[PDB]
Amino acid sequence: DVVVRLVYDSRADAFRAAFGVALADAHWVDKTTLLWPGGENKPIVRLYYSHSSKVAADSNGEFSDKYVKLTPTTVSQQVSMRFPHLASYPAFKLPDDVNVDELLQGETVAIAAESDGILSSATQVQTAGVLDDTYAAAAEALSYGAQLTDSGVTFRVWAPTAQQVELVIYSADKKVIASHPMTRDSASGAWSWQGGSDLKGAFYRYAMTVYHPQSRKVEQYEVTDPYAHSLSTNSEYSQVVDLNDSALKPEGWDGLTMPHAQKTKADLAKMTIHESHIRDLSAWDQTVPAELRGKYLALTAQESNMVQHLKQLSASGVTHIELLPVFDLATVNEFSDKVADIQQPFSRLCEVNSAVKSSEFAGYCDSGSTVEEVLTQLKQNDSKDNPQVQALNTLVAQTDSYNWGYDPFHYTVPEGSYATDPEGTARIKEFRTMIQAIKQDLGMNVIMDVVYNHTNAAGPTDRTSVLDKIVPWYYQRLNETTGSVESATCCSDSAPEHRMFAKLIADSLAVWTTDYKIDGFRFDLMGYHPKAQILSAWERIKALNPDIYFFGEGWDSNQSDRFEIASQINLKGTGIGTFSDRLRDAVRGGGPFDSGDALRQNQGVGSGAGVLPNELTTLSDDQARHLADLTRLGMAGNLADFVLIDKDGAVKRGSEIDYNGAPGGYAADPTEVVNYVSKHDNQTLWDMISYKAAQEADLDTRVRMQAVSLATVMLGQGIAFDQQGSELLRSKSFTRDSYDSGDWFNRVDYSLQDNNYNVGMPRSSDDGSNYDIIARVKDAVATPGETELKQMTAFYQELTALRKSSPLFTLGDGATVMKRVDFRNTGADQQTGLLVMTIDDGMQAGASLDSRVDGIVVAINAAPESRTLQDFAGTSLQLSAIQQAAGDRSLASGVQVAADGSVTLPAWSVAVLELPQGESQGAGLPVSSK
Ligand SMILES: OC[C@H]1O[C@H](O[C@H]2[C@H](O)[C@@H](O)[C@@H](O[C@H]3[C@H](O)[C@@H](O)[C@@H](O)O[C@@H]3CO)O[C@@H]2CO)[C@H](O)[C@@H](O)[C@@H]1O
Ligand SMILES: OC[C@H]1O[C@H](O[C@H]2[C@H](O)[C@@H](O)[C@@H](O[C@H]3[C@H](O)[C@@H](O)[C@@H](O)O[C@@H]3CO)O[C@@H]2CO)[C@H](O)[C@@H](O)[C@@H]1O
Ligand SMILES: [Mg+2]
Ligand SMILES: [Mg+2]
Ligand SMILES: [Mg+2]
Ligand SMILES: [Mg+2]
């Protein structure tokens, strides 16, 4: 056959380098199929390979490395189904005798040439597809990690391209005590090593010898176990652990039960979530013991303000705590001597942070002040023209203990910095002690926020690249042309469409479910996962805990060209929940990406769109009433098929109500919809109201706007979700994206002195464009103090208590919602901002689900006027006893129910009314025919 042929010492030589290997747009997708544009209509197409070096031209423009001949072919059905985004690529066939194993041990390069054997293009090869086709089924059948057995221990790691893998065993002091070559299984490409039970507690890493296509070199490095279940401090070494060991469990752990049922849809619909962060809970609470502040174990401090506050929220109807990342994140240093927090001396900050020591704040190094004391004194002269609080805090953020933690280092070990001792197994028992305290002592279920859509890093060099060091280019999603790891998620996008990463996800969830007794999972950026993968994971976890609940962010991920995505639209009818942005934006106003004056112009139902305009808005009545349509639809569970009367009087199904061009209603059951008006992401509800409220809306009115906004969630049929501290009017001083804004901007004050509003301009890098609008709105009214915080907590607990009190609020099943739930004050003659929902328990609905009532009315008067309703004239309607008992502290203070059944609501009020049930089920509130 032909010889494919082509600072330098000749032009001739530099000229040859220009025709070399470029990009990575060839895809080896199965054993015998290669997809590559560069080979179309070319008489010579070959896959060259080199075990130990780069496929390169020799001295006189010759490609001498071993090659395999490729013949043109057409894509198979199987290939097009697996990789639809590649189905248009020119296909090429490999001989069916090719030793795939041999080629995958090193570099492979696709090379094309003309009839005379002259080179046109040469590119690197993406091999994830052939890896799955060759090894995945065999590898899926095995179990991974350091697995203690009755016989001893079996280590296993999947590394189908590695040339060598050794198991390195370390002493407690991190000295090498053994290095064992592992045994490669040819069918699966897994490597294993079996030893005795004496390895319990040992530290270990895998020493890899593996080609990495990013560097094009056979790399040698030690990597922690992607299936690690225990770690040394800062995740440097994995550790052999038996999670079933009683020494790693609090007393009574094996009998720990879920306090709230999750079996039926009606059970699930009661879910009322408090989204919390380990430091946000306790970092500021002086009544938590100092050594437990910012720790899992703070939840055991029963006498603390924070724990007593959570206990009261639970008693009032908050049912679930959702924890921001408590798997092992990368972005906090777990070595305490490398960290400085704001409660500590400025001198400590300077010793750990060279950016501070070289900054304008260096003069504070030998002061006697703490960092917090310095930040406090910086407040008085802080402004848009001198944003000095955030200037210092941005430096503090580099070396503090604070991060949301959407930065996965190891998926199946607890985070170490939240433990009192991050070295070894201690964090496991502390984490479980926290879970037990939440369930047993606080009476709430636990949801974990999980982040399988990306890794913290990829490539052969980064400290936190684990998966992409062990099986390069497999676990990350790559650009089809360049082979670069995509970053659409924020970071290093993962590839849950690949079989062994799907397996890693499911195996990880199994540990959190069985070993840590987690009750549900919130999937970060779930739209980057295939629908089929999320559903497969759910099927596997339901075998372990039949009542587990999955939900996540089902936003469009722009991955639909590669697979059917796990989105709001596509998950309809599956029982997987998604956050709904429909009611969220209708009630808050605007959207997450608004900036500048739009933050004020875009009022929501909760901040007086239409009815109480500010000086900048141009919102029309029609627009306001459209937001109310989205809000009503969301209060009915955001169902695709729910029938309502829209702002123009037209009969519309939920899918026909527009949300920014998309069908508004998307769900089959309300348990597929998670409603919210505040979350860790974007501005807090209070900060949104502060951006949007008319100047004449006083402080007490703004507190009621907060409660009215939350009422649309708490009294709706969707699952209810809220940010920790909404009940305390929580502010982040206008910070939109506070993931690294530290204790200062994320403070929640459980001593009830203030809501953390007006503590300095937020981070300039992301909110600087908002400084002008912030300065204009910030000082309109006073900052909330103890009086307003206590009043808001009472409003909040009134709402959750109402939701908890009757199964009519939480019907669960979509057909049941359609049979029972209706709205009044609809159409072109509605009173703007008055939301009136009815829930039938009468004879036409079916059985009485609530023996105390024949029906419920929810009236939310999001308006500065009193409103009168005649819709229930002649009925026996009564204001709920829960609200009557709150007197002038109720959201229903001043509501009048006249003798004739007419109801008058004051401005910015919420009333829950009921038809008392007598001897037999009554007529109720039948849904109107449409
Ligand atoms: O340096 C890593 C990464 O840091 C920053 O990204 C962070 C986002 O700013 C932060 O909001 C958070 O984003 C997650 C959302 O909170 C979560 O609810 C969901 O939507 O997923 C988001 C991604 O996980 O965390 C990310 C990562 O820490 C920064 O913006 C990036 O540019 C930077 O690369
Ligand atoms: O991923 C990095 C990104 O994280 C955070 O952005 C998140 C938004 O905060 C969050 O609201 C969500 O945005 C979605 C909208 O809510 C939804 O209505 C629709 O428009 O889709 C959006 C996603 O395309 O998710 C994003 C992405 O995580 C963080 O705030 C950003 O600063 C950061 O860059
Ligand atoms: Mg960590
Ligand atoms: Mg930080
Ligand atoms: Mg793409
Ligand atoms: Mg009844």
- CA 805 from centre of chain: 30
Q: Residue 86 belongs to a domain with what CATH number? A: 2.60.40.1130
Nearest-CA residue for atom 6 of ligand 1: 490
371: left (phi over 0), alpha (psi -120 to 50) or beta: alpha
Environment of ion ligand 3 (residues, CB < 5 A): 328-329, 415-416
Is the distance from the beta carbon of residue 595 to the nearest atom of ligand 2 less than 6 Å? Answer: no
Contact 706, 723 (CB under 8 A): no
The reported resolution of this PDB entry, expressed in Å, is 1.5
Q: After which residues is the chain broken (C to N over 2.5 A)?
A: 6
148 and 283 in a single domain? The answer is no
SS3 505: helix
Last residue of a domain, one of 184, 211, 242: 242
Using N-to-C axis directions, what is the helix angle for 621-635 and 699-714, rounded to 10°?
50
Is the distance from the beta carbon of residue 490 to the nearest atom of ligand 2 less than 6 Å? Answer: yes
Q: What are the helix (H) ranges across 868-913?
A: 881-886
Cα distance from N-terminal residue to C-terminal residue, the chain = 78
100: left (phi over 0), alpha (psi -120 to 50) or beta: alpha
> Does residue 11 sit within a domain?
no
Strands 643-645 and 33-35: unpaired
Strands 153-158 and 145-148: antiparallel
State which amino acid sits at residue 428.
I
Is the distance from the beta carbon of residue 681 to the nearest atom of ligand 2 less than 6 Å? Answer: yes
268 and 313 in a single domain? The answer is yes
Based on the number of CB atoms within 10 Å of its own CB, is 679 exposed (0-12), middle (13-18) or buried (19 or more)?
A: buried
106 and 157 in a single domain? The answer is no
768 and 853 in a single domain? The answer is no
- CA 808 from centre of chain: 30
126 and 140 in a single domain? The answer is no
Walk across the sheet containing 153-158 and list its strands. 145-148, 153-158, 190-195, 183-184
- Best residue for ligand 2 mutational test, from 555, 558, 581 (most atoms within 8 Å of Cβ): 555
Contact 222, 206 (CB under 8 A): yes
Task: Please give the distance, rounded to the nearest whole angstrom, from the Cα atom of residue 235 to the centre of ligand 3.
Answer: 6
Task: Give per-residue burial for 205-231: e unless 16+ CB within 10 Å, then b.
Answer: bbbbebbbbbebebbebbbbbbbbbbb
User: Of 231, 692, 647, 653, nearest to 419 (Cα)?
Assistant: 231
Task: Please give the distance, rounded to the nearest whole angstrom, from the Cα atom of residue 198 to the centre of ligand 1.
Answer: 41
Please list the helix, strand and coil fractions of the chain in percent, rounded to the nearest 5, in that order.
Answer: 30, 20, 45
* Atom of ligand 1 lying closest to residue 491 CA: 34
Distance of alpha carbon 495 from alpha carbon 473, whole angstroms: 10
Strands 272-276 and 719-723: parallel
Task: Please give the distance, rounded to the nearest whole angstrom, from the Cα atom of residue 35 to the centre of ligand 5.
Answer: 16
> Does residue 8 sit within a domain?
no
Q: What are the helix (H) ranges across 778-895?
A: 786-805, 814-820, 881-886
- Best residue for ligand 1 mutational test, from 332, 452, 490 (most atoms within 8 Å of Cβ): 490
Domain that holds residue 686: 243-843
* Atom of ligand 1 lying closest to residue 454 CA: 24
User: Of 633, 678, 683, nearest to 659 (Cα)?
Assistant: 633
Q: Count of CB atoms within 10 A of residue 920's CB?
A: 8
Task: Please give the distance, rounded to the nearest whole angstrom, from the Cα atom of residue 736 to the centre of ligand 1.
Answer: 12
Based on the number of CB atoms within 10 Å of its own CB, is 487 exposed (0-12), middle (13-18) or buried (19 or more)?
A: middle
553 is catalytic: yes
Q: Count of CB atoms within 10 A of residue 102's CB?
A: 11
* Atom of ligand 1 lying closest to residue 449 CA: 18
- Best residue for ligand 1 mutational test, from 277, 322, 415, 739 (most atoms within 8 Å of Cβ): 739
> Does residue 864 sit within a domain?
yes
User: Of 332, 286, 335, nearest to 306 (Cα)?
Assistant: 286
581 and 667 in a single domain? The answer is yes
Is the distance from the beta carbon of residue 592 to the nearest atom of ligand 2 less than 6 Å? Answer: yes
Which residue spans within 333-440 are E strands per DSSP? 408-414
> Does residue 384 sit within a domain?
yes
Task: Report residue 71: phi and psi, to 5°.
Answer: -115, 145
> Does residue 4 sit within a domain?
no
Distance of alpha carbon 602 from alpha carbon 212, whole angstroms: 49
Which helix (H) or strand (E) is 93 found in, with range?
strand 91-93
Task: Please give the distance, rounded to the nearest whole angstrom, from the Cα atom of residue 878 to the centre of ligand 6.
Answer: 14
Torsion over CA: 557, 560, 564, 568 (sign): positive
124 and 141 in a single domain? The answer is no
Is the distance from the beta carbon of residue 98 to the nearest atom of ligand 2 less than 6 Å? Answer: no
Of 328, 415, 524, 788, the catalytic one is 524
The DSSP 8-state label assigned to residue 194 in this structure reads: E
The DSSP 8-state label assigned to residue 95 in this structure reads: P
Cα atoms in the 13 Å half-sphere on the side-chain side of 747: 21
Task: Please give the distance, rounded to the nearest whole angstrom, from the Cα atom of residue 397 to the centre of ligand 4.
Answer: 4
Distance of alpha carbon 108 from alpha carbon 61, whole angstroms: 18
Q: Residues near 584 by Cβ (< 8 Å), separated by ≥ 6?
A: 675, 676, 677
Is the distance from the beta carbon of residue 662 to the nearest atom of ligand 2 less than 6 Å? Answer: no
Contact 476, 467 (CB under 8 A): yes
Q: What are the helix (H) ranges across 779-875?
A: 786-805, 814-820
Of 553, 585, 672, 841, the catalytic one is 553
> Does residue 433 sit within a domain?
yes
User: Of 717, 720, 614, nearest to 677 (Cα)?
Assistant: 720
Last residue of a domain, one of 103, 134, 165: 134
> Does residue 12 sit within a domain?
no
524 is catalytic: yes
Is the distance from the beta carbon of residue 638 to the nearest atom of ligand 2 less than 6 Å? Answer: no
624 and 516 in a single domain? The answer is yes
Distance of alpha carbon 407 from alpha carbon 451, whole angstroms: 8
727 and 866 in a single domain? The answer is no
Last residue of a domain, one of 108, 134, 160: 134
Nearest-CA residue for atom 4 of ligand 1: 490
- 3-state SS of 284-296 is CCCCCCHHHCCCH
Work out how many domains the chain is built from and give that number: 4
Distance of alpha carbon 240 from alpha carbon 231, whole angstroms: 9
Distance of alpha carbon 398 from alpha carbon 747, whole angstroms: 18
Contact 838, 829 (CB under 8 A): no
Q: Residue 260 belongs to a domain with what CATH number? A: 3.20.20.80
Nearest-CA residue for atom 16 of ligand 1: 681
487 and 631 in a single domain? The answer is yes
> Does residue 6 sit within a domain?
no
790 and 879 in a single domain? The answer is no
Q: Residue 171 belongs to a domain with what CATH number? A: 2.60.40.10
114 and 216 in a single domain? The answer is no
Q: Count of CB atoms within 10 A of residue 284's CB?
A: 24
